[PDB]
Amino acid sequence: RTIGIIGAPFSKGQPRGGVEEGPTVLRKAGLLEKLKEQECDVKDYGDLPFADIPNDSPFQIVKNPRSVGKASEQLAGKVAEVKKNGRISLVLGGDHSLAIGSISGHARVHPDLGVIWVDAHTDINTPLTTTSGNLHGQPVSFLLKELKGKIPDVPGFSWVTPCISAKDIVYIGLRDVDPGEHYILKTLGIKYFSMTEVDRLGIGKVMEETLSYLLGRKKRPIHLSFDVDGLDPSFTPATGTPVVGGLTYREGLYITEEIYKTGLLSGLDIMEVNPSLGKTPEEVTRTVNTAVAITLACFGLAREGNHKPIDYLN
Amino acid sequence: RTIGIIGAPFSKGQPRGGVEEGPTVLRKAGLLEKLKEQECDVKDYGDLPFADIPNDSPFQIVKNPRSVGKASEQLAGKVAEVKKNGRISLVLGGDHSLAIGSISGHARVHPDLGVIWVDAHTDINTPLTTTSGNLHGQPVSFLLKELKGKIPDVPGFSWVTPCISAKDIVYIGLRDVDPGEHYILKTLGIKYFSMTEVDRLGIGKVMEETLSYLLGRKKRPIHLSFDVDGLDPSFTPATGTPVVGGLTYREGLYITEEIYKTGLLSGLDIMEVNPSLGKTPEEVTRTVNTAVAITLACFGLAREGNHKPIDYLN
Amino acid sequence: RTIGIIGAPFSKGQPRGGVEEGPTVLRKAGLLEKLKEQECDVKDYGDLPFADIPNDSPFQIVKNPRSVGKASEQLAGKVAEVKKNGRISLVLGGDHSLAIGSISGHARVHPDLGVIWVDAHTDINTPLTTTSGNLHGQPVSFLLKELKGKIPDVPGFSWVTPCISAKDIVYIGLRDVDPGEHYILKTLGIKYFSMTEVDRLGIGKVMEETLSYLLGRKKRPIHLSFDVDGLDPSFTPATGTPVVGGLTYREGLYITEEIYKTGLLSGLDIMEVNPSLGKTPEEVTRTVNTAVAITLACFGLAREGNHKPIDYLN
Numbered sequence: 013r014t015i016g017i018i019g020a021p022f023s024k025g026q027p028r029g030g031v032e033e034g035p036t037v038l039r040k041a042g043l044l045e046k047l048k049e050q051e052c053d054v055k056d057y058g059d060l061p062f063a064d065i066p067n068d069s070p071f072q073i074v075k076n077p078r079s080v081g082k083a084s085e086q087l088a089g090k091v092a093e094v095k096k097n098g099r100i101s102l103v104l105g106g107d108h109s110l111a112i113g114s115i116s117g118h119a120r121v122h123p124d125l126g127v128i129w130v131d132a133h134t135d136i137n138t139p140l141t142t143t144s145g146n147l148h149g150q151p152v153s154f155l156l157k158e159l160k161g162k163i164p165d166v167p168g169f170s171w172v173t174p175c176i177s178a179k180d181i182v183y184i185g186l187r188d189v190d191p192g193e194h195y196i197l198k199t200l201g202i203k204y205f206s207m208t209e210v211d212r213l214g215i216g217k218v219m220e221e222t223l224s225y226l227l228g229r230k231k232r233p234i235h236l237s238f239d240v241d242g243l244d245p246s247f248t249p250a251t252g253t254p255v256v257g258g259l260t261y262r263e264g265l266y267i268t269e270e271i272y273k274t275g276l277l278s279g280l281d282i283m284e285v286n287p288s289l290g291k292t293p294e295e296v297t298r299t300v301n302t303a304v305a306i307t308l309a310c311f312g313l314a315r316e317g318n319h320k321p322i323d324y325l326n
Numbered sequence: 327r328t329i330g331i332i333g334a335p336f337s338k339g340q341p342r343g344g345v346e347e348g349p350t351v352l353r354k355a356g357l358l359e360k361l362k363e364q365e366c367d368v369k370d371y372g373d374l375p376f377a378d379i380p381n382d383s384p385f386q387i388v389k390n391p392r393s394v395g396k397a398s399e400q401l402a403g404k405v406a407e408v409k410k411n412g413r414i415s416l417v418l419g420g421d422h423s424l425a426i427g428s429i430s431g432h433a434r435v436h437p438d439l440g441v442i443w444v445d446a447h448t449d450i451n452t453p454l455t456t457t458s459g460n461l462h463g464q465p466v467s468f469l470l471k472e473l474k475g476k477i478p479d480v481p482g483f484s485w486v487t488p489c490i491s492a493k494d495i496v497y498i499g500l501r502d503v504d505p506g507e508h509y510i511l512k513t514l515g516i517k518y519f520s521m522t523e524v525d526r527l528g529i530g531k532v533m534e535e536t537l538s539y540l541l542g543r544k545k546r547p548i549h550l551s552f553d554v555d556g557l558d559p560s561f562t563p564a565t566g567t568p569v570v571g572g573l574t575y576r577e578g579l580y581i582t583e584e585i586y587k588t589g590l591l592s593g594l595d596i597m598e599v600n601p602s603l604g605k606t607p608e609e610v611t612r613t614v615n616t617a618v619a620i621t622l623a624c625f626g627l628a629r630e631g632n633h634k635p636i637d638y639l640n
Numbered sequence: 641r642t643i644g645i646i647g648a649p650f651s652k653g654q655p656r657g658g659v660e661e662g663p664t665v666l667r668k669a670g671l672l673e674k675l676k677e678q679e680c681d682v683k684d685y686g687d688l689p690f691a692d693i694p695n696d697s698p699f700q701i702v703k704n705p706r707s708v709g710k711a712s713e714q715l716a717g718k719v720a721e722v723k724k725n726g727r728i729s730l731v732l733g734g735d736h737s738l739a740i741g742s743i744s745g746h747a748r749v750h751p752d753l754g755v756i757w758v759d760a761h762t763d764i765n766t767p768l769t770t771t772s773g774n775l776h777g778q779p780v781s782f783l784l785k786e787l788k789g790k791i792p793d794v795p796g797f798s799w800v801t802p803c804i805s806a807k808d809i810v811y812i813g814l815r816d817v818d819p820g821e822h823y824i825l826k827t828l829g830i831k832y833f834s835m836t837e838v839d840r841l842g843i844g845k846v847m848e849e850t851l852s853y854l855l856g857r858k859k860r861p862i863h864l865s866f867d868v869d870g871l872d873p874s875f876t877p878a879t880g881t882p883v884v885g886g887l888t889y890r891e892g893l894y895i896t897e898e899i900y901k902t903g904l905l906s907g908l909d910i911m912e913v914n915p916s917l918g919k920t921p922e923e924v925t926r927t928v929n930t931a932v933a934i935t936l937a938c939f940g941l942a943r944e945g946n947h948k949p950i951d952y953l954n
């Protein structure tokens with residue numbers, strides 16, 4: 013599998029700025045090295061340099077819209093470039109708002125992509141439904157074609173064009189969804205597997221249906237947006253919006269192992285890892301370690317084992 | 327959903343007296359407020375004042391029988407009253423012995439009720455089978471019609487009349503059952519799902535069968551007696567009789583979310599929460615928080631989300 | 641059920657010597673007493689005294705081959721003796737290398753035995769595939785008939801005769817398998833349920849298939865080799881090779897409860913418990929406690945309860 017690593021040290025989609033350290037701690041944990049330890053072809057396109065936009069007052073309640081909108085616009089470009097290089101874009105980012113540019117850039121090359129959004133949240137608040145104003149909780153609303161007409165023209169996002177339909181996305185792990193967000197869920201008929209469905213069906217059936225749902229009619233490129241708060245904070249504590257009762261370490265690896273096995277993974281986001289929020293140096297390493305393990309699984313690392321195409325017994 | 331809150335600060339069903347603080351810490355955690363934050367109609371009937379019965383020597387091995395028997399008799403009355411007010415009785419109690427009065431009072435109004443008992447124990451010891459003498463581990467024996475004839479006339483329980491049949495109760499979560507208790511299980515043919523069955527079937531199937539079992543022939547009012555030690559102590563540590571290998575936070579919420587969805591919940595007990603037993607201030611908050619989350623789920627709070635009947639996108 | 645307890649304080653199959661304390665801490669936790677508390681017939685054949693083999697240089701990369709080979713040869717003899725006494729051999733050991741002698745001795749009496757290997761590892765490295773040289777990670781390679789011809793004549797194992805076929809063994813819990821080990825897995829067609837399969841099917845189906853797999857054609861004696869690192873280190877931290885994402889306390893007990901229920905358990909190993917590796921006195925007790933609970937389950941202790949064949953209500 014050939015990857016296109018892209019560091020995205022951004023945080024203006026939410027209050028806490030430690031998420032910008034994401035690319036740093038992840039790379040320093042040997043991610044690139046570990047990918048190469050596998051049969052992975054890796055090209056690191058570096059960390060995107062997000063220049064400061066000192067003048068960026070709120071748009072109504074929406075915070076740092078110009079900074080956010082510009083970082084996603086830039087990202088979208090780098091992603092598109094890697095997708096043109098015939099590589100799977102791996103976005104080691106800051107907050108989840110970056111998803112807007114990652115998915116957008118991906119769709120430019122493969123407009124028929126299907127999205128898997130693992131998160132404890134749906135992040136589909138509109139600028140009028142969000143109560144926090146944090147954009148890392150509204151990325152999905154900017155992308156849905158069905159929602160084009162409700163989203164106001166927010167400074168910094170003029171370049172955006174909704175690229176995915178409500179039927180081309182599956183949510184897995186939900187356990188903290190706002191009222192307006194849930195209204196949108198049921199109204200647009202979005203397919204989701206909240207923690208209740210996971211508990212009911214088991215992660216195997218959940219993944220079986222998710223993949224059947226998105227790859228029913230035909231095979232299409234898959235984009236996986238992975239918010240680390242989708243996993244229980246007993247696994248990923250150094251994250252800004254933890255919610256108890258999350259997916260287990262195992263369920264996290266099962267999800268990714270199944271996605272990889274599709275052979276259709278083409279876009280991947282690893283978001284919301286914030287070292288600064290770790291209560292102890294071990295919570296940080298535990299969060300980073302869990303984050304790396306999930307990434308390796310997306311590119312082939314299997315729990316049952318791996319082996320090159322040779323005769324080990326000779 | 328309309329609730330009838332009833333505080334039951336009682337502890338004489340067992341040794342440790344910190345359980346009496348149950349109503350206090352639960353209410354102070356905003357339970358009433360959080361219920362109102364939902365579409366819940368709440369009337370708090372206050373904390374029942376249990377006067378001291380200084381003269382209450384053991385009956386054979388059975389401890390504090392008069393104190394226990396009187397608190398359940400009183401409770402039964404308050405429950406019946408709330409059930410007559412057309413409200414779902416919510417009993418924030420002390421020890422599980424109170425179940426005797428809660429279920430009894432409930433049955434007075436709805437004699438056809440079905441019982442779901444979530445606990446790590448079966449609490450069906452008779453005064454002759456119990457080895458500890460603690461009544462919080464014998465409540466079920468006073469209620470079963472099938473057992474009427476074996477239970478001795480214990481001071482304080484003359485007012486009791488067995489109200490439920492062995493076939494109108496399901497156990498979920500069992501992992502610490504005494505020999506005589508197990509003998510009673512198999513002999514009366516009581517339906518139960520111990521941790522082994524949960525592991526075997528999954529919580530979804532367990533709940534599917536539990537509800538099919540109790541609501542097969544017809545729909546009937548449901549009484550949920552929830553002992554917090556049914557959940558693993560990694561979730562509810564501040565409890566008197568913890569047993570490892572318990573139901574998860576998720577399984578706990580799944581159970582309740584499914585019960586609520588029946589629309590038949592009419593009686594609820596939240597028992598054995600003892601702040602005094604928390605090893606740290608966080609074990610207390612973790613136990614209380616888990617206790618509140620389970621209660622909210624019984625009245626509609628869903629992990630996938632909630633929304634009023636309006637147009638959020640306008 | 642009648643047991644034949646055998647202490648095996650050995651550690652030369654790996655670096656750390658604290659595993660030799662296994663028999664000691666296990667017995668001192670009341671294991672023999674607790675077995676008797678059940679309807680178990682127990683005869684403790686004592687702790688095998690492994691004399692020092694001061695002169696034992698590496699064989700290529702393989703470490704302490706003579707010490708290891710001799711301890712398994714001795715063990716095999718004691719096991720065979722207990723199996724001749726019509727008792728179920730219970731091997732409280734040190735490292736997993738001892739499996740070589742336990743299974744070998746067992747097969748002498750019941751050559752048709754079936755093996756269940758619960759571990760986070762496959763321990764099927766050959767002296768030429770192992771990279772660590774630690775024999776506790778190669779035991780399975782000495783036993784497989786299919787592998788006879790690749791394994792070099794290692795000092796200390798001249799007495800060995802491969803006793804099991806690749807089709808008479810099931811692995812459960814795998815999550816850290818070496819490349820050569822995985823090559824062997826797929827090539828010999830060994831049946832296994834890694835953590836991925838557990839996640840996919842559930843432990844109930846996994847056990848259903850494992851037992852159907854080994855007891856399909858006919859009923860045969862079952863040998864359970866239980867490496868405590870098969871369970872998540874949140875349960876068994878005092879172990880030499882911990883790997884996160886392991887089987888839960890519940891899954892561990894479910895496995896054993898199901899094996900016991902077969903009535904065919906005839907050989908049992910409880911390996912890799914190392915007190916010296918516990919970060920705190922509680923990690924040690926937690927590891928030992930978990931180890932005892934699993935053993936009791938193999939001999940009848942059920943979570944739903946137990947009761948003698950009498951009338952408890954009289």
Ligand SMILES: N[C@@H](CCCC[B-](O)(O)O)C(=O)O
Binds near residue numbers: 143144146
């Ligand atoms: N729904 C909340 C929290 C969303 C959290 C964003 B996320 O999932 O990216 O961490 C909000 O709108 O602020």
Ligand SMILES: N[C@@H](CCCC[B-](O)(O)O)C(=O)O
Binds near residue numbers: 447464
């Ligand atoms: N079976 C034990 C323990 C029962 C625990 C009571 B419970 O479930 O309410 O906490 C006894 O009879 O003392």
Ligand SMILES: N[C@@H](CCCC[B-](O)(O)O)C(=O)O
Binds near residue numbers: 735736737759772
């Ligand atoms: N595969 C590694 C680790 C095996 C661990 C051995 B065991 O499972 O017994 O703990 C090795 O060969 O050194």
Ligand SMILES: [Co+2]
Binds near residue numbers: 253
């Ligand atoms: Co999130």
Ligand SMILES: [Co+2]
Binds near residue numbers: 131
């Ligand atoms: Co998110």
Ligand SMILES: [Co+2]
Binds near residue numbers: 567
């Ligand atoms: Co209990």
Ligand SMILES: [Co+2]
Binds near residue numbers: 449553
């Ligand atoms: Co109870």
Ligand SMILES: [Co+2]
Binds near residue numbers: 759760761869870881
């Ligand atoms: Co192992």
Ligand SMILES: [Co+2]
Binds near residue numbers: 736759761776867
């Ligand atoms: Co092993």
